[PDB]
Design a protein around this ligand. Structure first.
Ligand code: HNI
Ligand code: HNI
Ligand code: HNI
Ligand code: HNI
Lengths: 146, 141, 141, 146
């Protein structure tokens, strides 16, 4: 599951260039557009009827900031992702009732968003490192389900 | 694609199940909740206590849908049309969970059909449940 | 099922790929081998490292198959009939890997098509690659 | 996975009643019948033309026995499955080139075979314990892939 020192440096280097608020809104929005059954958790967010209605939805954007904010904080703890995300794992299970498969879907969408943003800079080895990261985060968020 | 041989195997096996179908549906749900606890995230509004009448009632609904699918195995997309609508537009269960329930249905059948659960029938039942799952997720996006 | 808009989106995006189809196929394969090392189990006879002649050659084949699928988007089960035969009876790649390659194709397209890879087009391409994958595994059993 | 003391007890108790030879042959056989693309690894086993030919194949039966035998040994290391299967993990990756998804397919077939044999005795809690085991073994066998 773990990254080489070169991969950790690659992850940190790229993330320094990431506008977390913006990428968060983009990633959550694309999740709800590409996999629209994931809208089941966001009835209170209002209009989700078109791609533009989703991507520009202020509540989607706001929640995307929150989600990727927590993701970003976790990048400082790649050696202990399960510990880092334990309380959020418990919350998503016990209070929010979110199938952890959703974390895997979000991870893949985030990778696509990073590719879209960075272009050729998102090289195959950099992707590989980020695939390790999103798998690790999704597994950590799933770990305390019961 | 369900072969003519698959359809005969499924009809015979479910025929043997008979009026035990609702019971086996409930057992499959219980096995699923225990073996794959993430599936419980779709039932926070349920009473999930041991022997839950609400789970048993849901088991009967799932079983009745499967019984109807067997009876219309030549035309399952049409027979399951209303149910597929509900899954796509309301329930919105992630597709990965259909494989979990299918597996638990297979385990339930295996535990109750010592003679009928041959390797060939096992194969046919797995294809059938996968086919039902495909129909139920066919309108998701 | 692919909607009218899906088919418009897929044709436009793949058209923009144009002469780069083979290049992008090979890149997607490389991304897959690096991101998902288990997929390398299907190519023990290949050089899989960057600049591989074998990966470049296979990338061209994959891309050309996708181009054909786009050209016959309303009849993919028949247009890809020989290829689905080969996958079912010879290659026998486990179905899980098709999602991995599909993902890496999306990443490749996103990295090369800044203007074209909108959320709607992203959605359509994902559906398209899932549909192709379904066809290629449709004769497995 | 982390098994509870109660589940560790249930696993060991049921396995003490298992004919590993028969169950192994049955498990590998049904894998090849139910998921016939898995036959791709066993061309040298000879006749796999029909279900009866698969189930009754001596090399299929023999290999199933060997595989379940290693599985059986792994049950003595439930708190360190990754450690004990590390050698076999590398072997299946580098020498045999086996997609680890196959380990998961075999695990589920094994659970079906156990249910078929034990009937009512294969209770939902017993199944849940064995699902942890087969997932743990599959994950352990996949862990050293590269
Ligand atoms: C598709 C559903 C979904 C996904 C993929 C997802 C993925 C993630 C990931 C993955 C990297 C992270 C780090 C994360 C973090 C958070 N989520 Ni998630 N969440 C999801 C559904 C929710 C919902 C629903 C809430 C509550 C929203 C609300 O209405 O308040 C939530 C709330 C949160 C909160 C706020 C906690 C609180 O209210 O106390 C954080 C932080 N999250 N979410
Ligand atoms: C793990 C989640 C899950 C899976 C895999 C699943 C898979 C299946 C399968 C697969 C073979 C079948 C035949 C089936 C049949 C049904 N489901 Ni499922 N359902 C699931 C979670 C639900 C939930 C949740 C409901 C709503 C129940 C309620 O009472 O609120 C539901 C409702 C139903 C209903 C009731 C429809 C109605 O009331 O009009 C039927 C019938 N189903 N479900
Ligand atoms: C991870 C494994 C894997 C995946 C996901 C996959 C998915 C796909 C997809 C999905 C969209 C497409 C369109 C596709 C197309 C092709 N593949 Ni794939 N193939 C895969 C592993 C192979 C292998 C292995 C071969 C044999 C190549 C060789 O040279 O031996 C192959 C060969 C081919 C060929 C060459 C056929 C011929 O020689 O007549 C085509 C075309 N393919 N493959
Ligand atoms: C679908 C393919 C497949 C699966 C699911 C699988 C699952 C498993 C599992 C799962 C719990 C275990 C414990 C296991 C253990 C073993 N395998 Ni598997 N193996 C598989 C494909 C093989 C093949 C192929 C060989 C070599 C065959 C031979 O004997 O030449 C093999 C050889 C072995 C050997 C012999 C090692 C040696 O000779 O030094 C052991 C032990 N294994 N295999």
């Amino acid at each position: 599951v773990h990254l080489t020192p070169e991969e950790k440096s690659a992850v940190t280097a790229l993330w320094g260039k990431v506008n977390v608020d913006e990428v968060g809104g983009e990633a959550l929005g694309r999740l709800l557009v590409v996999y629209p059954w994931t809208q089941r958790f966001f009835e209170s967010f209002g209009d989700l009827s078109t791609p533009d209605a989703v991507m520009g939805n202020p509540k989607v954007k706001a929640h995307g900031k929150k989600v990727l904010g927590a993701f970003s904080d976790g990048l400082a703890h790649l050696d202990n992702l399960k510990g880092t995300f334990a309380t959020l794992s418990e919350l998503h299970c016990d209070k929010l009732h979110v199938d952890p498969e959703n974390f895997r879907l979000l991870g893949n969408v985030l990778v696509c968003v990073l590719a879209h943003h960075f272009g050729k800079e998102f090289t195959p080895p950099v992707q590989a490192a980020y695939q390790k990261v999103v798998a690790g985060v999704a597994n950590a968020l799933a770990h305390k389900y019961h | 694609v369900l072969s003519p041989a698959d359809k005969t195997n499924v009809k015979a096996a479910w025929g043997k199940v008979g009026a035990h179908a609702g019971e086996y549906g409930a057992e499959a749900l219980e096995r699923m909740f225990l073996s794959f606890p993430t599936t419980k995230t779709y039932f926070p509004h349920f009473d999930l206590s041991h022997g839950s009448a609400q789970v048993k009632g849901h088991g009967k609904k799932v079983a009745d849908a499967l019984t109807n699918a067997v009876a219309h195995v030549d035309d399952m997309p049409n027979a399951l049309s209303a149910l597929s609508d509900l899954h796509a537009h309301k329930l919105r269960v992630d597709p990965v969970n259909f494989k979990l329930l299918s597996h638990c249905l297979l385990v339930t059948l295996a535990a109750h059909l010592p003679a009928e659960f041959t390797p060939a029938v096992h194969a046919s039942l797995d294809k059938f449940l996968a086919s039902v799952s495909t129909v139920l997720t066919s309108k998701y996006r």
